[PDB]
Amino acid sequence: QSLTTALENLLRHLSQEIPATPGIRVIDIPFPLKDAFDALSWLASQQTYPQFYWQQRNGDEEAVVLGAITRFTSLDQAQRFLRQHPEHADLRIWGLNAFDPSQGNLLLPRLEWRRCGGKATLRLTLFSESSLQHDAIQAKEFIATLVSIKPLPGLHLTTTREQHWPDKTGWTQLIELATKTIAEGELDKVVLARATDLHFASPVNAAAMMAASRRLNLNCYHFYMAFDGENAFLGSSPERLWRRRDKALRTEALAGTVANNPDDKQAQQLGEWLMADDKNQRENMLVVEDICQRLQADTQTLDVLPPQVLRLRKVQHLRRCIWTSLNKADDVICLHQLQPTAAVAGLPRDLARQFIARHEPFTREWYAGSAGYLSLQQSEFCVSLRSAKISGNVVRLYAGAGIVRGSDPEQEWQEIDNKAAGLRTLLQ
């Protein structure tokens, strides 16, 4: 109903002048938040088929995009385009960067609904290499294809078949191989993952899994990409890759973990053991020093903030925030200096990555990549952790583990079932 009114308003802008000439128009319609608007299930209800949902971890900034005017296969390519339209420094491109940051799947959205705290805007962009007028007609057709909000079911779902990429033995050998390699010297840490394929009787409603995940994981970023009706990648991640506002850059070392506890007093106590334990404290510093080296050339002075414990559902994390000024506002420098995270790849990055490439018995794809948005004036991406790939009736779950000098196979298999269980519950 607040949507109905905003769409009618879009149709009036589409009915006015509009020249038959190349260019760009951005039509911003105020979207009143007297609220009732579940953007997620509005988006899931639609039948046009690149779809993207994103909410930043504080819960105050939230977007849904529908339809692609242009698709981008990399963030580098996305930025090159945005640089041609400085007159729209808030034109956002949404989506994913693969684990390999040089591959992406990002879109210039036809329709963007965005909320900041208490204000929302419904955004239609017109874009044409020859005729805005004729683009406007396609936008009208697109609007008429919009469908009413249908309620988002819960998930029953029992498993037809499960398959681990590394099963127990493969994992053992992999870990042994990883310890032996670090024992030779050279590298120091390798984050190895295991994919878990859950086959189901009928297709999996990906959006409904996103809604489940969002409800479970407070203080996380939420991201959901529907590539088409049968394929999606989604998750809920506590971790920020970067945030850029003009030249001001924020990133973080989130490494070192203890259990959370409901009794929010053992949770404080457990956090004050984390804060003081040497092993976890060092692990965190090695990550900050890695981030710092990875961006000293492109940056002024780096301020490392006092460490805090970030309390989540099952787990609590050592976080040390890193703030700085970029020599220039450039998101491919952020992406390529920060992605593969030490937390996600390992030791010397390239040695860790070569190892992952050769011996990890599956492709990570979007997992442990990046999700968010960019514009000239600002960007934010989270690390695509705690995530799943859906394909028809197959859900692939991902869980990684840091491997070092002394790591033990059995132990680390256990740590990985623990992470994977988090995702498994979203399917009941």
Short mmCIF file of N, CA, C and O in Angstrom, two decimals, residues 295-386:
data_model
loop_
_atom_site.label_atom_id
_atom_site.label_comp_id
_atom_site.label_asym_id
_atom_site.label_seq_id
_atom_site.Cartn_x
_atom_site.Cartn_y
_atom_site.Cartn_z
N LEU A 295 47.93 -2.73 3.40
CA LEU A 295 47.45 -1.43 2.97
C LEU A 295 48.25 -0.17 3.33
O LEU A 295 47.75 0.94 3.12
N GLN A 296 49.48 -0.34 3.80
CA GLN A 296 50.36 0.78 4.15
C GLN A 296 50.69 1.68 2.94
O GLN A 296 50.75 2.90 3.06
N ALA A 297 50.92 1.07 1.77
CA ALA A 297 51.28 1.82 0.56
C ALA A 297 50.15 2.75 0.09
O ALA A 297 50.41 3.85 -0.42
N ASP A 298 48.91 2.31 0.27
CA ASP A 298 47.75 3.02 -0.26
C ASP A 298 47.08 3.95 0.74
O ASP A 298 46.01 4.50 0.49
N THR A 299 47.75 4.15 1.87
CA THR A 299 47.09 4.75 3.02
C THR A 299 47.97 5.74 3.78
O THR A 299 49.20 5.70 3.69
N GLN A 300 47.32 6.63 4.51
CA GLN A 300 48.00 7.52 5.45
C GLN A 300 48.42 6.72 6.70
O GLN A 300 48.87 5.57 6.56
N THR A 301 48.29 7.28 7.90
CA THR A 301 48.58 6.47 9.09
C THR A 301 47.36 5.64 9.50
O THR A 301 46.22 6.09 9.41
N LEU A 302 47.65 4.43 9.93
CA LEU A 302 46.64 3.48 10.34
C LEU A 302 46.47 3.55 11.85
O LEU A 302 47.44 3.37 12.58
N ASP A 303 45.24 3.84 12.28
CA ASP A 303 44.85 3.74 13.68
C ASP A 303 44.23 2.38 13.97
O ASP A 303 43.17 2.04 13.45
N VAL A 304 44.92 1.61 14.80
CA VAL A 304 44.35 0.39 15.36
C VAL A 304 43.66 0.72 16.70
O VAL A 304 44.31 1.23 17.62
N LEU A 305 42.36 0.46 16.80
CA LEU A 305 41.57 0.80 17.98
C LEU A 305 41.72 -0.23 19.11
O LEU A 305 42.22 -1.33 18.89
N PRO A 306 41.28 0.13 20.35
CA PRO A 306 41.37 -0.85 21.44
C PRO A 306 40.53 -2.10 21.13
O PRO A 306 39.42 -1.96 20.64
N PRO A 307 41.04 -3.30 21.47
CA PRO A 307 40.33 -4.55 21.20
C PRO A 307 39.02 -4.62 21.98
O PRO A 307 38.96 -4.17 23.12
N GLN A 308 37.99 -5.17 21.34
CA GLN A 308 36.73 -5.51 21.99
C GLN A 308 36.32 -6.94 21.70
O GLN A 308 36.82 -7.56 20.75
N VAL A 309 35.40 -7.44 22.53
CA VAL A 309 34.76 -8.74 22.33
C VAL A 309 33.41 -8.51 21.68
O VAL A 309 32.58 -7.78 22.21
N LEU A 310 33.18 -9.14 20.53
CA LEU A 310 31.90 -9.04 19.85
C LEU A 310 31.07 -10.26 20.19
O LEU A 310 31.46 -11.39 19.88
N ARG A 311 29.94 -10.03 20.84
CA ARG A 311 29.10 -11.13 21.31
C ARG A 311 28.04 -11.48 20.28
O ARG A 311 27.22 -10.64 19.92
N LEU A 312 28.07 -12.73 19.82
CA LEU A 312 27.08 -13.25 18.87
C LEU A 312 26.24 -14.34 19.51
O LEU A 312 26.19 -14.45 20.75
N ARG A 313 25.59 -15.16 18.69
CA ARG A 313 24.66 -16.15 19.20
C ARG A 313 25.35 -17.29 19.94
O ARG A 313 25.02 -17.61 21.07
N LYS A 314 26.32 -17.93 19.28
CA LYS A 314 26.92 -19.16 19.79
C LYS A 314 28.36 -18.89 20.20
O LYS A 314 29.01 -19.70 20.88
N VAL A 315 28.83 -17.73 19.77
CA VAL A 315 30.25 -17.48 19.69
C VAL A 315 30.51 -16.02 20.00
O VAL A 315 29.66 -15.16 19.79
N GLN A 316 31.68 -15.77 20.58
CA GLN A 316 32.17 -14.42 20.84
C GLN A 316 33.55 -14.26 20.23
O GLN A 316 34.37 -15.20 20.25
N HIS A 317 33.82 -13.06 19.73
CA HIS A 317 34.99 -12.81 18.89
C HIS A 317 35.81 -11.63 19.35
O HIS A 317 35.27 -10.56 19.61
N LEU A 318 37.12 -11.81 19.34
CA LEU A 318 38.05 -10.70 19.47
C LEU A 318 38.02 -9.83 18.22
O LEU A 318 38.24 -10.32 17.11
N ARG A 319 37.73 -8.55 18.39
CA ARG A 319 37.78 -7.61 17.28
C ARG A 319 38.66 -6.41 17.59
O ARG A 319 38.55 -5.79 18.65
N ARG A 320 39.51 -6.07 16.63
CA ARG A 320 40.33 -4.89 16.70
C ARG A 320 40.03 -4.13 15.40
O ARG A 320 40.30 -4.62 14.29
N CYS A 321 39.38 -2.98 15.54
CA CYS A 321 38.99 -2.17 14.40
C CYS A 321 40.16 -1.35 13.85
O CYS A 321 41.01 -0.87 14.61
N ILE A 322 40.18 -1.19 12.52
CA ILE A 322 41.28 -0.48 11.86
C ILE A 322 40.71 0.64 11.01
O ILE A 322 39.92 0.39 10.10
N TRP A 323 41.11 1.87 11.33
CA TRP A 323 40.61 3.09 10.67
C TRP A 323 41.74 3.89 9.99
O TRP A 323 42.83 4.02 10.56
N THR A 324 41.48 4.44 8.80
CA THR A 324 42.53 5.16 8.08
C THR A 324 42.02 6.04 6.95
O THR A 324 40.82 6.08 6.68
N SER A 325 42.92 6.76 6.28
CA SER A 325 42.54 7.49 5.07
C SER A 325 43.30 6.96 3.88
O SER A 325 44.54 6.88 3.90
N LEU A 326 42.53 6.62 2.85
CA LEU A 326 43.07 6.19 1.56
C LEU A 326 43.72 7.38 0.88
O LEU A 326 43.24 8.52 1.00
N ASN A 327 44.84 7.14 0.19
CA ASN A 327 45.42 8.15 -0.67
C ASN A 327 44.44 8.58 -1.74
O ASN A 327 44.40 9.76 -2.09
N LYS A 328 43.63 7.64 -2.21
CA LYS A 328 42.57 7.96 -3.15
C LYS A 328 41.36 7.05 -2.98
O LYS A 328 41.49 5.90 -2.56
N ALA A 329 40.18 7.58 -3.27
CA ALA A 329 38.93 6.84 -3.13
C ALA A 329 38.86 5.81 -4.26
O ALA A 329 38.53 6.15 -5.40
N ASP A 330 39.18 4.56 -3.94
CA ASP A 330 39.32 3.55 -4.98
C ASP A 330 38.96 2.15 -4.43
O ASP A 330 39.75 1.55 -3.71
N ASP A 331 37.78 1.64 -4.77
CA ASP A 331 37.31 0.36 -4.23
C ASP A 331 37.98 -0.91 -4.74
O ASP A 331 37.87 -1.96 -4.07
N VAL A 332 38.69 -0.85 -5.87
CA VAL A 332 39.39 -2.05 -6.29
C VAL A 332 40.66 -2.19 -5.47
O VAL A 332 41.10 -3.31 -5.18
N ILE A 333 41.24 -1.06 -5.07
CA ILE A 333 42.36 -1.12 -4.12
C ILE A 333 41.92 -1.68 -2.74
O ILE A 333 42.66 -2.45 -2.13
N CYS A 334 40.72 -1.34 -2.28
CA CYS A 334 40.22 -1.93 -1.04
C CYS A 334 39.99 -3.43 -1.22
O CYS A 334 40.49 -4.25 -0.43
N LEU A 335 39.25 -3.78 -2.27
CA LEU A 335 38.92 -5.17 -2.55
C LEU A 335 40.18 -6.02 -2.64
O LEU A 335 40.32 -7.03 -1.94
N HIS A 336 41.11 -5.59 -3.49
CA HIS A 336 42.28 -6.42 -3.82
C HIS A 336 43.39 -6.37 -2.76
O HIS A 336 44.20 -7.30 -2.69
N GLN A 337 43.43 -5.32 -1.95
CA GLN A 337 44.37 -5.33 -0.81
C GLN A 337 43.84 -6.12 0.40
O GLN A 337 44.61 -6.75 1.10
N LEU A 338 42.52 -6.13 0.60
CA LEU A 338 41.91 -6.83 1.75
C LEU A 338 41.36 -8.23 1.48
O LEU A 338 41.41 -9.09 2.36
N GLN A 339 40.82 -8.47 0.29
CA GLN A 339 40.27 -9.79 0.02
C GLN A 339 41.36 -10.76 -0.38
O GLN A 339 42.40 -10.34 -0.88
N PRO A 340 41.07 -12.07 -0.35
CA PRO A 340 41.38 -13.07 0.63
C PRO A 340 41.88 -12.44 1.92
O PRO A 340 42.91 -11.77 1.94
N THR A 341 41.10 -12.60 2.99
CA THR A 341 41.51 -12.19 4.33
C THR A 341 42.49 -13.23 4.84
O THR A 341 42.40 -14.41 4.49
N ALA A 342 43.42 -12.80 5.68
CA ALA A 342 44.25 -13.73 6.44
C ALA A 342 43.37 -14.71 7.22
O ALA A 342 43.69 -15.89 7.32
N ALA A 343 42.26 -14.21 7.75
CA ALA A 343 41.32 -15.03 8.53
C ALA A 343 40.65 -16.12 7.68
O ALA A 343 40.13 -17.11 8.20
N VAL A 344 40.71 -15.95 6.37
CA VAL A 344 39.95 -16.77 5.46
C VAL A 344 40.86 -17.58 4.52
O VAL A 344 40.48 -18.65 4.04
N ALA A 345 42.07 -17.07 4.30
CA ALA A 345 43.08 -17.73 3.46
C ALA A 345 44.27 -18.27 4.27
O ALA A 345 44.44 -19.49 4.37
N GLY A 346 45.08 -17.37 4.83
CA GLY A 346 46.15 -17.77 5.73
C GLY A 346 47.50 -17.09 5.61
O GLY A 346 47.59 -15.94 5.16
N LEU A 347 48.54 -17.84 6.02
CA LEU A 347 49.95 -17.42 6.20
C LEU A 347 50.46 -16.28 5.31
O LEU A 347 49.93 -15.16 5.38
N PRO A 348 51.52 -16.53 4.51
CA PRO A 348 51.66 -15.68 3.33
C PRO A 348 50.49 -16.02 2.42
O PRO A 348 50.30 -17.19 2.06
N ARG A 349 49.67 -15.02 2.09
CA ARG A 349 48.42 -15.22 1.36
C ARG A 349 48.57 -16.15 0.14
O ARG A 349 47.85 -17.15 0.03
N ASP A 350 49.53 -15.84 -0.74
CA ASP A 350 49.69 -16.57 -2.01
C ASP A 350 50.04 -18.04 -1.83
O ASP A 350 49.55 -18.90 -2.58
N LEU A 351 50.88 -18.33 -0.84
CA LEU A 351 51.19 -19.72 -0.49
C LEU A 351 49.95 -20.43 0.05
O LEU A 351 49.69 -21.59 -0.30
N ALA A 352 49.18 -19.73 0.87
CA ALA A 352 47.92 -20.25 1.40
C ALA A 352 46.91 -20.49 0.28
O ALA A 352 46.23 -21.52 0.26
N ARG A 353 46.83 -19.54 -0.65
CA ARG A 353 45.88 -19.64 -1.76
C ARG A 353 46.25 -20.75 -2.74
O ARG A 353 45.38 -21.52 -3.16
N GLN A 354 47.54 -20.84 -3.08
CA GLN A 354 48.04 -21.93 -3.94
C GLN A 354 47.66 -23.27 -3.34
O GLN A 354 47.21 -24.17 -4.06
N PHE A 355 47.83 -23.40 -2.02
CA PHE A 355 47.46 -24.63 -1.33
C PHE A 355 45.96 -24.93 -1.45
O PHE A 355 45.58 -26.05 -1.79
N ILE A 356 45.12 -23.92 -1.18
CA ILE A 356 43.68 -24.06 -1.32
C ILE A 356 43.31 -24.48 -2.74
O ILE A 356 42.57 -25.45 -2.93
N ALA A 357 43.87 -23.79 -3.73
CA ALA A 357 43.63 -24.08 -5.15
C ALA A 357 43.93 -25.54 -5.54
O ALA A 357 43.16 -26.14 -6.28
N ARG A 358 45.02 -26.09 -5.02
CA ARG A 358 45.48 -27.42 -5.42
C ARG A 358 44.80 -28.58 -4.69
O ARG A 358 44.65 -29.67 -5.24
N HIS A 359 44.42 -28.34 -3.44
CA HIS A 359 44.08 -29.46 -2.58
C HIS A 359 42.67 -29.40 -2.02
O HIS A 359 42.15 -30.43 -1.59
N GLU A 360 42.06 -28.22 -2.02
CA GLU A 360 40.68 -28.11 -1.59
C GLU A 360 39.74 -28.69 -2.65
O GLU A 360 39.56 -28.09 -3.71
N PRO A 361 39.13 -29.85 -2.36
CA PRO A 361 38.36 -30.71 -3.26
C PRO A 361 37.03 -30.15 -3.75
O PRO A 361 36.12 -30.92 -4.08
N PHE A 362 36.93 -28.84 -3.81
CA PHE A 362 35.77 -28.15 -4.36
C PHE A 362 36.16 -26.70 -4.59
O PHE A 362 37.21 -26.25 -4.12
N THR A 363 35.32 -25.97 -5.31
CA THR A 363 35.53 -24.54 -5.54
C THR A 363 34.72 -23.71 -4.54
O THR A 363 33.54 -23.99 -4.30
N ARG A 364 35.35 -22.70 -3.96
CA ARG A 364 34.68 -21.86 -2.96
C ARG A 364 33.59 -21.01 -3.57
O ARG A 364 32.53 -20.84 -2.97
N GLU A 365 33.86 -20.51 -4.77
CA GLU A 365 32.93 -19.64 -5.50
C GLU A 365 32.70 -18.38 -4.69
O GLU A 365 33.64 -17.63 -4.45
N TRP A 366 31.45 -18.18 -4.25
CA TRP A 366 31.07 -16.96 -3.51
C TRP A 366 31.44 -17.00 -2.02
O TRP A 366 31.60 -15.95 -1.38
N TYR A 367 31.58 -18.22 -1.50
CA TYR A 367 31.92 -18.42 -0.10
C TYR A 367 33.25 -17.77 0.23
O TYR A 367 34.24 -17.98 -0.48
N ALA A 368 33.25 -16.98 1.30
CA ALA A 368 34.45 -16.29 1.79
C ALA A 368 34.94 -15.25 0.81
O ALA A 368 36.07 -14.76 0.89
N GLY A 369 34.05 -14.90 -0.12
CA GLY A 369 34.18 -13.69 -0.91
C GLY A 369 33.69 -12.49 -0.13
O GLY A 369 34.06 -12.30 1.02
N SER A 370 32.80 -11.72 -0.75
CA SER A 370 32.43 -10.38 -0.32
C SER A 370 31.01 -10.08 -0.78
O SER A 370 30.64 -10.51 -1.88
N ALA A 371 30.23 -9.34 0.01
CA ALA A 371 28.87 -8.95 -0.39
C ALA A 371 28.57 -7.55 0.09
O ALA A 371 28.92 -7.21 1.22
N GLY A 372 27.93 -6.75 -0.74
CA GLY A 372 27.65 -5.37 -0.38
C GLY A 372 27.39 -4.50 -1.59
O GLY A 372 26.74 -4.94 -2.54
N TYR A 373 27.89 -3.28 -1.57
CA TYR A 373 27.63 -2.33 -2.63
C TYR A 373 28.77 -1.32 -2.77
O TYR A 373 29.59 -1.14 -1.85
N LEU A 374 28.83 -0.68 -3.93
CA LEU A 374 29.77 0.40 -4.13
C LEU A 374 29.09 1.53 -4.85
O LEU A 374 28.13 1.33 -5.61
N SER A 375 29.60 2.72 -4.59
CA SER A 375 29.27 3.92 -5.34
C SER A 375 30.54 4.76 -5.24
O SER A 375 31.46 4.42 -4.50
N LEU A 376 30.60 5.84 -6.00
CA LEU A 376 31.76 6.72 -5.95
C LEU A 376 31.93 7.22 -4.52
O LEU A 376 33.00 7.03 -3.93
N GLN A 377 30.89 7.81 -3.95
CA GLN A 377 31.00 8.45 -2.61
C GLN A 377 31.26 7.51 -1.44
O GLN A 377 31.93 7.89 -0.48
N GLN A 378 30.77 6.27 -1.54
CA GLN A 378 30.91 5.29 -0.46
C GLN A 378 30.63 3.86 -0.92
O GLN A 378 29.92 3.64 -1.91
N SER A 379 31.16 2.91 -0.15
CA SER A 379 30.92 1.51 -0.36
C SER A 379 31.01 0.79 0.96
O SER A 379 31.68 1.25 1.87
N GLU A 380 30.36 -0.37 1.05
CA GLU A 380 30.58 -1.29 2.15
C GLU A 380 30.40 -2.73 1.67
O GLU A 380 29.40 -3.05 1.02
N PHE A 381 31.34 -3.60 2.04
CA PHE A 381 31.22 -5.04 1.81
C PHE A 381 31.50 -5.84 3.08
O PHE A 381 32.40 -5.48 3.84
N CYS A 382 30.77 -6.93 3.30
CA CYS A 382 31.12 -7.86 4.37
C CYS A 382 31.83 -9.09 3.81
O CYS A 382 31.71 -9.37 2.63
N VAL A 383 32.56 -9.81 4.65
CA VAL A 383 33.11 -11.09 4.25
C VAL A 383 31.97 -12.10 4.17
O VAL A 383 31.21 -12.26 5.12
N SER A 384 31.84 -12.78 3.04
CA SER A 384 30.72 -13.71 2.82
C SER A 384 30.87 -15.02 3.59
O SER A 384 31.03 -16.10 3.00
N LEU A 385 30.81 -14.91 4.91
CA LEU A 385 30.97 -16.07 5.81
C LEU A 385 29.61 -16.59 6.19
O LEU A 385 28.60 -15.94 5.90
N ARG A 386 29.56 -17.74 6.85
CA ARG A 386 28.30 -18.31 7.33
C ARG A 386 27.24 -18.36 6.22
O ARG A 386 26.10 -17.92 6.40
#
